[PDB]
Design a protein around this ligand. Sequence first.
Ligand code: GDP
Ligand code: MG
Length: 169
Amino acid sequence: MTEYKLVVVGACGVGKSALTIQLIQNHFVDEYDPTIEDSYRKQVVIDGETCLLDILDTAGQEEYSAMRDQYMRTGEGFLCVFAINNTKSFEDIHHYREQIKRVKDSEDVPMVLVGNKCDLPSRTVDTKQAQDLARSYGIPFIETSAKTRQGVDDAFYTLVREIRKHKEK
Ligand SMILES: Nc1nc2c(ncn2[C@@H]2O[C@H](COP(=O)(O)OP(=O)(O)O)[C@@H](O)[C@H]2O)c(=O)[nH]1
Ligand SMILES: [Mg+2]
């Protein structure tokens, strides 16, 4: 019955939908419309706690900006995703970090930084660069592949653990 409201954000094409569908349905989707924004739910056990994950797979601009503000305010934790072969997507993390803090009007928002597509040979963002950014934010960094499932549970479960740490204070 404890529910965690998770929000997946990041530039178009980084694997937000693929990561979410891998977590929920345990398969890799080759093709999922980049413009579809939807929420998914699943019951999981995390550190012995049976809980419900309610995950919003975001798709960018909204019909009205109030819709963006609404999901950022109600969201409890944010998975900030870039792709390791797309430097622009890594640079865009700065924008998402700032915008979420701005809407929530808080310095302390549970977040995890995710470098997806680590199964690919092409890499433009080395691990050190991403670790340096995560260190500056004081948040965890996890490399994932939605295709092989590497790191997928860890990314989402770590985010839940970050929410728990925020709530106990
Ligand atoms: N090789 C590989 N491809 C991926 C991975 N994650 C996503 N993709 C592919 O990257 C493209 C964009 O993924 P998508 O989930 O639609 O990204 P979104 O726009 O962030 O929702 C799709 O063609 C996916 O098949 C991954 O971890 N490895
Ligand atoms: Mg998508």
